[PDB]
Design an enzyme around this catalytic site. Structure first.
Site, PDB file in Angstrom:
ATOM      1  N   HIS A 298       0.981  -0.813  -0.039  1.00 49.86           N
ATOM      2  CA  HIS A 298       0.187  -0.135   0.096  1.00 49.86           C
ATOM      3  C   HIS A 298       0.384   1.307  -0.062  1.00 49.86           C
ATOM      4  CE1 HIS A 298      -3.300   2.526   0.934  1.00 49.86           C
ATOM      5  NE2 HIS A 298      -2.702   2.801   2.172  1.00 49.86           N
TER       6      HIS A 298
HETATM    7  C1  LIG Z   1       5.721   9.058   6.780  1.00 53.49           C
HETATM    8  C2  LIG Z   1       4.820   8.120   7.248  1.00 53.49           C
HETATM    9  C3  LIG Z   1       4.979   7.496   5.853  1.00 53.49           C
HETATM   10  C4  LIG Z   1       3.859   5.751   5.555  1.00 53.49           C
HETATM   11  N1  LIG Z   1       4.175   5.009   5.028  1.00 53.49           N
HETATM   12  C5  LIG Z   1       3.240   3.959   4.602  1.00 53.49           C
HETATM   13  C6  LIG Z   1       3.219   3.272   3.361  1.00 53.49           C
HETATM   14  O1  LIG Z   1       3.863   3.983   2.117  1.00 53.49           O
HETATM   15  N2  LIG Z   1       2.865   1.627   3.271  1.00 53.49           N
HETATM   16  C7  LIG Z   1       2.821   1.440   4.987  1.00 53.49           C
HETATM   17  O2  LIG Z   1       1.548   0.219   4.958  1.00 53.49           O
HETATM   18  N3  LIG Z   1       2.488   2.239   5.527  1.00 53.49           N
HETATM   19  C8  LIG Z   1       3.356   3.626   5.434  1.00 53.49           C
HETATM   20  N4  LIG Z   1       3.164   3.800   7.189  1.00 53.49           N
HETATM   21  C9  LIG Z   1       2.672   3.548   8.158  1.00 53.49           C
HETATM   22  C10 LIG Z   1       1.491   3.786   8.740  1.00 53.49           C
HETATM   23  O3  LIG Z   1       0.579   4.604   8.508  1.00 53.49           O
HETATM   24  C11 LIG Z   1       0.743   2.939   9.968  1.00 53.49           C
HETATM   25  O4  LIG Z   1       1.672   1.276   9.870  1.00 53.49           O
HETATM   26  C12 LIG Z   1      -0.331   2.665  10.520  1.00 53.49           C
HETATM   27  O5  LIG Z   1      -1.054   3.958  10.108  1.00 53.49           O
HETATM   28  C13 LIG Z   1      -0.577   2.154  11.376  1.00 53.49           C
HETATM   29  O6  LIG Z   1      -1.748   1.540  12.144  1.00 53.49           O
HETATM   30  P1  LIG Z   1      -2.607   1.709  13.390  1.00 53.49           P
HETATM   31  O7  LIG Z   1      -3.897   1.030  12.980  1.00 53.49           O
HETATM   32  O8  LIG Z   1      -1.429   0.830  14.273  1.00 53.49           O
HETATM   33  O9  LIG Z   1      -3.128   3.313  13.599  1.00 53.49           O
HETATM   34  P2  LIG Z   1      -2.820   4.185  12.854  1.00 53.49           P
HETATM   35  O10 LIG Z   1      -2.804   4.070  11.752  1.00 53.49           O
HETATM   36  O11 LIG Z   1      -1.203   5.174  13.041  1.00 53.49           O
HETATM   37  O12 LIG Z   1      -4.186   5.576  14.060  1.00 53.49           O
HETATM   38  C14 LIG Z   1      -3.830   5.410  14.956  1.00 53.49           C
HETATM   39  C15 LIG Z   1      -4.327   6.427  15.681  1.00 53.49           C
HETATM   40  O13 LIG Z   1      -4.933   6.681  16.755  1.00 53.49           O
HETATM   41  C16 LIG Z   1      -5.461   7.776  17.038  1.00 53.49           C
HETATM   42  N5  LIG Z   1      -4.937   8.017  18.896  1.00 53.49           N
HETATM   43  C17 LIG Z   1      -3.990   7.938  19.256  1.00 53.49           C
HETATM   44  N6  LIG Z   1      -3.666   7.979  21.744  1.00 53.49           N
HETATM   45  C18 LIG Z   1      -5.109   8.065  20.874  1.00 53.49           C
HETATM   46  C19 LIG Z   1      -5.469   8.664  21.973  1.00 53.49           C
HETATM   47  N7  LIG Z   1      -5.525   8.231  23.393  1.00 53.49           N
HETATM   48  N8  LIG Z   1      -7.276   7.802  22.162  1.00 53.49           N
HETATM   49  C20 LIG Z   1      -7.398   8.503  20.541  1.00 53.49           C
HETATM   50  N9  LIG Z   1      -7.326   8.306  19.949  1.00 53.49           N
HETATM   51  C21 LIG Z   1      -5.981   8.277  19.421  1.00 53.49           C
HETATM   52  C22 LIG Z   1      -4.428   8.494  16.533  1.00 53.49           C
HETATM   53  O14 LIG Z   1      -5.139   9.851  16.036  1.00 53.49           O
HETATM   54  C23 LIG Z   1      -4.283   7.987  15.039  1.00 53.49           C
HETATM   55  O15 LIG Z   1      -6.373   8.388  14.401  1.00 53.49           O
HETATM   56  C24 LIG Z   1       3.747   5.819   7.103  1.00 53.49           C
HETATM   57  C25 LIG Z   1       3.909   5.756   8.144  1.00 53.49           C
HETATM   58  C26 LIG Z   1       4.267   7.762   8.106  1.00 53.49           C
HETATM   59  C27 LIG Z   1       4.614   8.109   9.698  1.00 53.49           C
END
Ligand SMILES: Cc1cc2nc3c(=O)[nH]c(=O)nc-3n(C[C@H](O)[C@H](O)[C@H](O)COP(=O)(O)OP(=O)(O)OC[C@H]3O[C@@H](n4cnc5c(N)ncnc54)[C@H](O)[C@@H]3O)c2cc1C
Ligand SMILES: Cc1cc2nc3c(=O)[nH]c(=O)nc-3n(C[C@H](O)[C@H](O)[C@H](O)COP(=O)(O)OP(=O)(O)OC[C@H]3O[C@@H](n4cnc5c(N)ncnc54)[C@H](O)[C@@H]3O)c2cc1C
Ligand SMILES: Cc1ccc(OCC(=O)N2CC[NH+](C)CC2)cc1
Ligand SMILES: [Br-]
Ligand SMILES: [Br-]
Ligand SMILES: [Br-]
Ligand SMILES: [Br-]
EC number: 1.8.1.12
Lengths: 489, 487
Positions: free
Chosen positions: A462
């Site tokens: 992705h």
């Molecule tokens: C610059 C960058 C580029 C990336 N590019 C890629 C890519 O090309 N491909 C890929 O596969 N991955 C990529 N990633 C990684 C990807 O973004 C993450 O792996 C993914 O978003 C993590 O998903 P998750 O379900 O762990 O949490 P996330 O998608 O991080 O969601 C966490 C959410 O929790 C919320 N939150 C946090 N603390 C609290 C709280 N206490 N109470 C309520 N809400 C809270 C936040 O606001 C956030 O919206 C990239 C990351 C970054 C930083």
């Protein structure tokens, strides 16, 4: 002067013939001779050492489609903030053709050096034909009364002379060209009609559309209702739309009846319907036919099919025991990597004590239209004739980057066709940027009998277009004993 | 107070997959908490998650924008002519278009909540009050005003990660990728700190959009960038970034940063070297986002590294409390987080335990040119298998001899268990590598052998057909030692 003797004589130094020849000599130590009519690309004979792909086929056309893609790139760049003087933009066709010619000639020269250097792999210049079961004659021209340059004795003979463009017998056919001449046009045509619904007419329409001078127009005509027969129907319809959206006019259910010269020298085309069109170039791309006439196959009795290709069995054997045929001359799948596979298989069988036959199913291939197609396997209407229950998984959407680029008409289409009784993937069909690159490893999957669940269980990369293939779990619709329906009964 | 089957903290990649599946597939009652309804300052991530708001989605758009620098130059070889002195890269237009695209996704998820039975969104900061109660407050401060108290049979921790910032004097004059997405102007001189994909990807972005006289420098504290990727490709992408004007400082690490009178930054490296830049972007790592959750209230155990500890089914040590995604500090990828969320709900609310497979996951770097990879690199393979073959192809494609970008070598490598030919890893660098690699991940779930690739007929002309043309190993590892020939 004495005749020369060989284990194998190959007529035609093209995709399939060079593969067989190189392999027989360097892998199995055989003495090989290869015949072709010309040592580098272009008129008078167009194809040459290297074959149709290298000289007037896949290799030059892909470079030219790449050049045409920059028309889209320059325009789409503005959505991402790029600014420049739009009025200064010009597509220099002569530079494109000169760069292409140099690239092709480099390949020509490297093949020439391979023959100068390699033990037991010799090249002969001229027109090859069959005199007897074990003697190939090389003459100065295709005329069997022309002078003899060599007689080549041969325990085994491989026919690999490829195909040639078909020209319809209409009045004024002499005012038209084929793709052979299109690769050498001194200037890009202001107005051009490409005749045909196949991939060559479609690819060249895209090329002319990007390099046309300011007042120009590309028209593609096809005698039936929908272009690109044999490809996925959804993709056939979408590619029509996206070609139209880039300014190409598509006349379906139309076919030239005659061509004449206007007083200014332009071409006046009259269609069977009575419609008329004035253009500067008419390019016929209505088909390609196997090159058998010059081989004098009557001398030894090699059988041709009703259709006109050399008849072969699964091991590329003709009805004469030691004479074989591969590639476009067999009038089946006309693709460079199929001819190469057949050549390598033939040599492994004959000289390698490892029998092997080419698998003509589940062959991945591409159309370098703008935007392109990548496909492997069966289309759904074919699959529905052979399997009681067929499922179709389908995703079609404009990618986010083209909502910024402004080319919102560029819908990416991904479709997977299955045997629903057991989930086996029967075909995959793709339209959109990157589709020829995406489909290659899909061919490996199909040769491993992948099921739809193998795709769905795979974790996506992705963000890509390709990840759509791994995110489809529920059929969009079905075929039940040949009948299309959204749901199973 | 309100009663739910499942409360999800974090409306991100993994959290939204789990919530939507639990509600629509299993008819459960679901509440999802996030701190912001759309993207940007002050909390950057929001509804949609890190990928959607300040991650994969906006950065891919911006990398696509940066690639036009190459396309405009490369078009000349194919006969395209225009006034090169008139070309300029409008960063503000790029940012505005990106902002509109992300905001559209934000609004879409809003409607999804409004339209779906059993799926409710709550704005604010969630934390664990008791083993079956989730509290939502106004700010990250655990003493700010309570807004909701949600009791739950099941709790899912899915708060993601956050940029790691080193403890050096002047760290406060540096930014992370969060702020990079919103810079008012493109930095003329920028230092990106780190060897991983985020540093490398932004380096390419700033390189294309920098004003006249600009310079992008990437520094990394060890010898070679992009640890964990194929070594041939780490060396080649280093070379090709350098050919496009980016300076790669290896074996260098900032020791302090200080303010200059003109507003720019004075960076002092551990080595004594100095560099003045307009922006310093730290991209040295991302750490699990656990500190605001009050995990001590219930005793959820963490690993030494700081992730929430989980078993293969995403279960913590506390029954009915689960963690998925970046907070588990494993593979930090959006499709892994999504897979984990779906497996979790299928296990808990369906009659089908499912665990995510963390091997053979395909992934990419959108460097210019980009990387696509799936499975094991050769030196990891050589520690698990007695005999490893490496098949290698590396050349400049014909079109880039015409384009003038002759440094753009395409690299394709296949790593096998040589004892049976099983493909252990595939690694690619060049245009289209992220698209090429996806079906390779499917191949690896069919136990494809090198001969399965080589016996497949190629699509011609493509870069991808290189993967079906390699018969003979280039070299081997035997008992962990590299050698050109077998013993
Ligand atoms: C610059 C960058 C580029 C990336 N590019 C890629 C890519 O090309 N491909 C890929 O596969 N991955 C990529 N990633 C990684 C990807 O973004 C993450 O792996 C993914 O978003 C993590 O998903 P998750 O379900 O762990 O949490 P996330 O998608 O991080 O969601 C966490 C959410 O929790 C919320 N939150 C946090 N603390 C609290 C709280 N206490 N109470 C309520 N809400 C809270 C936040 O606001 C956030 O919206 C990239 C990351 C970054 C930083
Ligand atoms: C415009 C165009 C685009 C194409 N694009 C693609 C593409 O993208 N992908 C793809 O896979 N395929 C493509 N093809 C098809 C591909 O070119 C052929 O399938 C392939 O070259 C056929 O290989 P072959 O070995 O049959 O013969 P060829 O490669 O045609 O070689 C036959 C050779 O025999 C020589 N010859 C003929 N008669 C004699 C004789 N009597 N004596 C001696 N020599 C003789 C010819 O000069 C020629 O060099 C394209 C074809 C065309 C026309
Ligand atoms: C004819 C042409 C083609 C491509 C271009 O892209 C911009 C560029 O080359 N840059 C490198 C130098 N930086 C200071 C600015 C970005 C510009 C002009
Ligand atoms: Br021109
Ligand atoms: Br499935
Ligand atoms: Br570092
Ligand atoms: Br290192």
């Amino acid at each position: 002067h004495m005749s020369k003797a060989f284990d194998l004589v190959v007529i035609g130094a093209g995709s399939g013939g060079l593969e067989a020849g190189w392999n027989a000599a360097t892998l199995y130590g055989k003495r090989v001779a290869v015949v072709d009519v010309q040592t580098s690309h272009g008129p008078p004979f167009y194809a040459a050492l290297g074959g149709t792909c290298v000289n007037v086929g896949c290799v030059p056309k892909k470079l030219m489609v790449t050049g045409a893609q920059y028309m889209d790139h320059l325009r789409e760049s503005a959505g991402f903030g790029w600014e420049f003087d739009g009025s200064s933009v010009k597509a220099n066709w002569k530079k494109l053709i000169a760069a292409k010619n140099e690239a092709v000639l480099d390949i020509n020269k490297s093949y020439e050096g391979m023959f100068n250097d390699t033990e037991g792999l010799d090249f002969f210049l001229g027109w090859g034909s069959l005199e007897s079961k074990n003697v190939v004659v090389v003459r100065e021209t295709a005329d069997p009364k022309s002078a003899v340059k060599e007689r080549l004795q041969a325990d085994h003979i491989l026919l690999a002379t490829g195909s040639w463009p078909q020209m319809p017998a209409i009045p004024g056919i002499e005012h038209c060209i084929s793709s052979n001449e299109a690769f050498y046009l001194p200037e890009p045509p202001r107005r051009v009609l490409t005749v045909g619904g196949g991939f060559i007419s479609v690819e060249f329409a895209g090329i002319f559309n990007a390099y046309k001078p300011p007042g120009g127009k590309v028209t593609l005509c096809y005698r039936n209702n929908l272009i690109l027969r044999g490809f996925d129907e959804t993709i056939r319809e979408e590619v029509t739309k996206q070609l139209t959206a880039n300014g190409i006019e598509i006349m379906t259910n139309e076919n030239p009846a005659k061509v004449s010269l206007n007083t200014d020298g332009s071409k006046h085309v009259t269609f069977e319907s009575g419609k008329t069109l004035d253009v500067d170039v008419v390019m016929m791309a209505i088909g390609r036919i196997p090159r058998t006439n010059d081989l004098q196959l009557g001398n030894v009795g090699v059988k041709l099919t009703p259709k006109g290709g050399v008849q072969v069995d699964e091991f590329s054997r003709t009805n004469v025991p030691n004479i074989y045929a591969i590639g476009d001359i067999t009038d089946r799948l006309m693709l460079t990597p199929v001819a190469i596979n057949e050549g390598a298989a033939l040599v492994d069988t004959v000289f390698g004590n490892k029998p092997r036959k080419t698998d003509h199913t589940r062959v991945a291939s591409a159309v370098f239209s703008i935007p392109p197609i990548g496909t492997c396997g069966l289309i759904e209407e074919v699959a529905a004739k052979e399997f009681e229950k067929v499922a179709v998984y389908m995703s079609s959407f404009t990618p986010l980057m083209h909502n910024i680029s402004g080319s919102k008409y560029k819908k990416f289409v991904a479709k997977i066709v299955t045997n629903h009784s057991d989930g086996t993937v029967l075909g995959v069909h793709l339209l959109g940027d990157g589709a020829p690159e995406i489909i290659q490893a899909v061919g490996v999957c199909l040769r491993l009998n992948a099921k739809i669940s193998d795709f769905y269980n795979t974790i996506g990369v992705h963000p890509t277009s390709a990840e759509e293939l791994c995110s489809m779990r529920t059929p969009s619709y079905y075929y039940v004993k040949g009948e299309k329906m959204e749901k199973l009964p």
